[PDB]
């Protein structure tokens, strides 16, 4: 009931019924939850 309206407008941003921009790009990545996957990032951790 609190956020029945928060949705994604065609400008790739998040706005409620009042058009108040809440989040510039959904999930701050512009990507649906289905497409994501877990991954191991190699760069961080190993010695120089």
């Amino acid at each position: 009931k609190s956020m029945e309206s928060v949705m994604v407008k065609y400008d790739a941003t998040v706005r409620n019924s009042i058009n108040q921009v809440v989040q510039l790009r959904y999930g701050e990545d512009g990507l649906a939850g289905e497409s994501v996957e877990f991954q191991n990032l190699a760069t961080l951790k190993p010695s120089n």
Partner: protein, 81 residues
């Protein structure tokens, strides 16, 4: 103006479903068919063949949040699938 095209060229699943359904609707009511069908009865397969052949005679109207609208023809649109 052909330059002011802000949204993505990727027509989304919402429009694909709407166009497929509505296309099949008038196809069932015997609207003229521009597709060379191999012979089918239900409107849905014919509409799907039309969608994949990319000659729908419909132009979609997207509502940019300011109130302005942009039109997108199916021909210029690109299927994600």
């Amino acid at each position: 103006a052909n330059q002011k095209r802000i949204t993505t060229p990727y027509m989304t699943k919402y429009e694909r479903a709407r166009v497929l359904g509505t296309r099949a609707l008038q196809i069932a009511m015997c609207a003229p068919v521009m597709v060379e069908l191999e012979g089918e009865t239900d409107p849905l397969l014919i509409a799907m063949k039309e969608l994949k052949a990319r000659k729908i005679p419909i132009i979609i109207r997207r509502y940019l949040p300011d109130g302005s609208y942009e039109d997108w023809g199916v021909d210029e649109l690109i299927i994600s699938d």
